[PDB]
Ligand binder design. Structure first.
Ligand code: CU1
Length: 74
């Protein structure tokens, strides 16, 4: 995914990378930006030792943006 809509990205001990966008929703991906899908209940520990659980509010928030990406006025 793009890193234009992201505001915070954590590096995961798993080797993946979560791009948390400005809305507060986080797009689960790998550090290369290849779509990596994750269900709810998964513990993502950052390089800080910060445990962030993929919840039903965070699992699929990514694909919807990938369906377009230019104008979008509603
Ligand atoms: Cu995740």
């Amino acid at each position: 995914v793009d890193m234009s809509n992201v505001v915070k990205t954590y590096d995961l001990q798993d080797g993946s990378k979560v791009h948390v966008f400005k809305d507060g929703k986080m797009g689960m991906e790998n550090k290369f930006g290849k779509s990596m899908n994750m269900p709810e209940g998964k513990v993502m520990e950052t390089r800080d030792g910060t445990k962030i659980i993929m919840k039903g509010n965070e699992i699929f928030r990514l694909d919807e943006a990938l369906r377009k990406g230019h104008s979008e006025g509603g």
